[PDB]
């Protein structure tokens, strides 16, 4: 049940324009990354709420769902889209059921709750700029001096996770650049980690198995978490988990909660995305680019039975408890969009 069944593509552009403008920005990867998708997904629905007129609540939850179903097929793999939607849907039917009852409680039809949703939407937006700032503080219960740590590729959440510990504890981290797609940011992170007083070492992606033998913990940042606790993460992370489990090395995941999604990884081949081979082999090698098959995926699936701990804005939680974070944050009716 998408939106085009409700509103004509042209009148959508007049009623809620930013929606139609977002889909373009969403398919063209003008806005990628789960955070940038998340915050922009919210404040788009802000204007939507501030622009739709309606009478009964069942109009909204059927309307806002419909735009979401298209807002997903724009680029579905950027999961943070629906997660902001699915959370909004519960946000209204909670604000509904609380008001429909507190009015019944005032006893011996007022769709003017739009500004409450906006006060509820902006609440979740303000939570996003409060993702790392309340996650970085969990380090001092996990990072300790003289320990050896391994991560992979740029991940500011993990970056801020360590640097907070570096304030008082001195220790060492090991960085595996996320070749080919996380190369740039990963190098930068290590250069920043060095300033904070962290014996940081940059290694090729293939040097992972070698050094893990003397690694205490591995910290990882993901691109999203799926309904089975599995991980969709930027390329080359399974190399770390598989090398970790081979050494009984604990695996820790520092992720926000807006990436936690209930969609179930049915077929992986419809999850991973494939970027341009230009990041792997130069266009000049013309003989090769013709005679061969060149692929550059930039996601990676690691199964849930491989993560030992989840650092979230709500706290540390085993993977076998993620579901209770879902049902306390979403609604099973909104699994599919």
């Amino acid at each position: 049940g998408p939106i085009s069944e409700f509103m004509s593509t042209i009148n959508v552009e007049h009623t809620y324009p930013a929606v139609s403008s977002l889909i373009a920005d969403l398919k063209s990867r003008k806005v990628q990354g789960p955070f940038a998708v998340a915050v922009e997904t919210a404040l788009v629905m802000r204007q939507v709420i501030s622009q739709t007129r309606w009478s009964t609540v069942d109009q909204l939850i059927d309307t806002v769902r419909a735009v979401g179903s298209t807002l997903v097929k724009a680029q579905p793999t950027e999961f943070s889209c629906g997660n902001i939607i699915r959370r909004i849907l519960r946000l209204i039917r909670e604000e509904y059921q609380e008001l429909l009852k507190t009015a019944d409680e005032n006893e011996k039809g007022g769709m003017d709750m739009r500004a409450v949703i906006i006060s509820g939407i902006q609440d979740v937006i303000d939570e996003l700029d409060k993702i790392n700032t309340d996650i970085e503080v969990q380090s001092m219960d996990h990072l300790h001096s003289n320990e050896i740590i391994l991560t992979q590729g740029c991940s500011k959440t993990v970056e801020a996770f360590l640097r907070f510990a570096a304030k008082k504890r001195k220790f060492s981290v090991i960085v595996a650049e996320g070749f080919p797609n996380n190369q740039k940011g990963s190098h930068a992170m290590a250069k920043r980690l060095a300033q904070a007083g962290i014996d940081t070492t940059v290694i090729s992606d293939a040097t992972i198995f070698a050094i893990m033998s003397r690694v205490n913990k591995v910290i990882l940042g993901t691109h999203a978490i799926l309904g089975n606790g599995g991980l969709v993460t930027y390329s080359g992370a399974q190399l770390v988990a598989q090398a970790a489990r081979h050494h009984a090395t604990p695996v820790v995941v520092c992720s926000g909660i807006y990436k936690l999604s209930p969609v179930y990884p049915y077929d992986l081949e419809s999850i991973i995305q494939l970027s341009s081979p230009d990041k792997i082999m130069s266009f000049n090698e013309g003989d090769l680019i013709s005679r061969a098959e060149i692929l550059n995926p930039y996601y990676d699936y690691i199964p849930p039975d491989l993560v030992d701990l989840f650092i979230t804005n709500l706290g540390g939680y085993p993977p076998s408890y993620l579901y209770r974070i879902m049902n306390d944050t979403y609604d099973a009716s909104d699994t599919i969009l």
Binding site: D205, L239, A292, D300
Partner: peptide, 22 residues
């Protein structure tokens, strides 16, 4: 990749971070 291609062999080329996928 050069050698095998110059011998007419079907080949695919991915970096090691694509092992899980390939």
């Amino acid at each position: 990749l050069k050698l095998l291609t110059e011998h007419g062999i079907e080949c695919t080329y991915v970096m090691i971070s694509a092992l899980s996928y390939i």
